[PDB]
Amino acid sequence: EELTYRLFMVATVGMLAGTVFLLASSREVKPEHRRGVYISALVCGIAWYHYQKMGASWESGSYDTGLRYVDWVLTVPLMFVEVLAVTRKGAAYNEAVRNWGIAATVMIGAGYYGETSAAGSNEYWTGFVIAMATYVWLMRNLQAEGEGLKGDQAVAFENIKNLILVGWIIYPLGYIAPVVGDFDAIREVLYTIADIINKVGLGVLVLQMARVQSG
Amino acid sequence: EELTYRLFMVATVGMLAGTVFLLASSREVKPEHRRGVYISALVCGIAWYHYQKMGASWESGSYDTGLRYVDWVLTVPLMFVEVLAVTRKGAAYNEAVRNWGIAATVMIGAGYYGETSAAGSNEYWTGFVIAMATYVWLMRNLQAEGEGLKGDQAVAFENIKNLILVGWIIYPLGYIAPVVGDFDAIREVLYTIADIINKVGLGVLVLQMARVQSG
Numbered sequence A, B: 001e002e003l004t005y006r007l008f009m010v011a012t013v014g015m016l017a018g019t020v021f022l023l024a025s026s027r028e029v030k031p032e033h034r035r036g037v038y039i040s041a042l043v044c045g046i047a048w049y050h051y052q053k054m055g056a057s058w059e060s061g062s063y064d065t066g067l068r069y070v071d072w073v074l075t076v077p078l079m080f081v082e083v084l085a086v087t088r089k090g091a092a093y094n095e096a097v098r099n100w101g102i103a104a105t106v107m108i109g110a111g112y113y114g115e116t117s118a119a120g121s122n123e124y125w126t127g128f129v130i131a132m133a134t135y136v137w138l139m140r141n142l143q144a145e146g147e148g149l150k151g152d153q154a155v156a157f158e159n160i161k162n163l164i165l166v167g168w169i170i171y172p173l174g175y176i177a178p179v180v181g182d183f184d185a186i187r188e189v190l191y192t193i194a195d196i197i198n199k200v201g202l203g204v205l206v207l208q209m210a211r212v213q214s215g
């Protein structure tokens, strides 16, 4: 139980560092590519706040699984937005933002729907199935987003895509874990680590893409 | 105590109502003038969320006074943004957003600094002066913003400006109340009512300006 607490504080500090790093480095890219960088720092700042609330809620003996999903419902759509903001602009950006944003919201909501039921129950499987399908629909969209890119942009986008494809697998895995057995304490540890890597990492890589686009 | 709880619940409903009204209504204006409407819906959505937490917190017995400031620090800057979204575009917008945003953030921060100390204390008066100066600077900026507007836009903007000018006076007044005397229960009530009116109201008027700009 102490490790779980300690990791919430480590994440708190990492998310803040990520936020301030990204805000500081935003001045280093051309204004027309800063949007993604700004949304990235926002994601990290939201996560910074929620990890503080998670950490307080854990050492007080009241730990709300709820606070995790509140974070995800905000940050997951925004993480798609970070990415779309460096791959698109104009009407096409506003369209993907709406369409992918809604899909990411539905994924997390289906998740929460299933999570708040008995594991193995019908609600649980329904949640999994609908979120998993939306997850797949999003990963496919993200894979399609790279087609047409050239040179250093293609390489920069390849890194953002692969961070999400590989890095986000742990979330559905964790959801499934407990029907396979007793993986409850470990899931909380792994998700925290994952969140730090996925949110600071993606910000960094969005910042790298924006620099490429600025040279 | 009971009225305060009651009002929290009413606010929660009112903020949600406002959010859905503004999102539904966003299709009725041209894409180029929707931004301010979208931010106004966001503003209402954030307050919806915080008022649910404020309600639940109030029922605890031990009510967290910081929740209010968490909402303000997010929403107050966004309200200035939703205003600048209908009075500005391009570079000017982005600059005003940064600077008025910072200013608004500082105002609420000073407030919080002073609110988290003894009433009458040194810390208290410092928070007040800094927040008030910043408030004054903002209102003076808001006033200047209408210059050059003609006809129906000048009228629509007069309404935005007067909602903020008149509607936000209650906040610093409530801050000073405690040093006159015992006003803790009533302040909560008045801030709640004010928030509904200022947040939903401003959204409606930004929508109305967007409609005017839409022809």
Ligand SMILES: *C/C=C(C)/C=C/C=C(C)/C=C/C1=C(C)CCCC1(C)C
Pocket: A072, A075, A076, A079, A107, A108, A110, A111, A112, A127, A128, A131, A132, A135, A168, A171, A172, A175, A195, A198, A199
């Ligand atoms: C910063 C946080 C991130 C990127 C969180 C991502 C979470 C997911 C991709 C969750 C996915 C889920 C499914 C695909 C199925 C099971 C239900 C969820 C919500 C755990």
Ligand SMILES: *C/C=C(C)/C=C/C=C(C)/C=C/C1=C(C)CCCC1(C)C
Pocket: B072, B075, B076, B079, B107, B108, B110, B111, B112, B127, B128, B131, B132, B135, B168, B171, B172, B175, B195, B198, B199
């Ligand atoms: C939706 C919430 C709104 C529009 C809240 C507005 C809050 C203020 C304008 C607060 C202002 C303050 C000062 C001018 C001085 C005393 C400290 C504050 C923060 C209460």
